[PDB]
């Protein structure tokens, strides 16, 4: 039973464009299920950061998929919505200036959050290896304190951060 730790973003995309198939590693390996969204009529989907899972594992989810999974943390979906509403009402009529800020000052965070998904540095690996021969890697995420490091699947990482891997073992001498 999973837990909603944080609501990272909010969008509207193809119906069905939710879950595992929506992670960045799945998307990179198979394309975006929300692919080139738009004529398409959509759904309200939330980008969610999970309890005990790295940001690299976030996934888009609709208030429904959430309930369908019995995830814990639903309370959070209400606050988020109540908060999102509070924001708008307060920014209905703001200077265009107020608006520029909001859009800049929000693109900043938008871009920041993405970093958490990229390995700034691998700092240790496992003595045990998958049947494929991949060890797991303790990864240090871009933008987050070492208290946020974590063990990630060897194969998963290698698909996109083989450098950090290569440069991790290279650093041994």
């Amino acid at each position: 039973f999973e837990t909603i730790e944080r609501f990272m973003d909010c969008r509207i995309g193809r119906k069905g464009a939710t879950g595992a198939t929506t992670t960045i590693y799945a998307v990179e390996a198979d394309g975006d299920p929300n692919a080139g969204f738009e004529k398409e009529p959509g759904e309200i989907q939330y980008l969610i950061k999970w309890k005990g899972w790295s940001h690299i594992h976030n996934t888009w989810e609709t208030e429904e998929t959430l309930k369908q999974q019995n995830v814990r943390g639903m309370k959070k979906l209400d606050n988020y919505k109540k908060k999102d509403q509070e924001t708008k009402r307060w920014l209905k009529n703001a200077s265009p200036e107020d608006v520029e800020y909001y859009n800049c000052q929000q693109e900043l965070t938008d871009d920041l959050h993405k970093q958490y998904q990229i390995v700034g540095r691998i700092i240790a690996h496992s003595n045990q290896k998958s049947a494929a021969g991949y060890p797991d890697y303790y990864c240090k995420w871009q933008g987050l304190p070492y208290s946020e490091c974590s063990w990630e699947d060897g194969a998963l990482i290698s698909k996109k951060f083989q450098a950090c891997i290569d440069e991790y073992f290279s650093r041994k001498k």
Binding site: G19, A20, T23, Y25, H57, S130, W151, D153, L156
Partner: peptide
């Protein structure tokens, strides 16, 4: 290990 499988 552990991804979203």
């Amino acid at each position: 290990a552990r991804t979203k499988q």
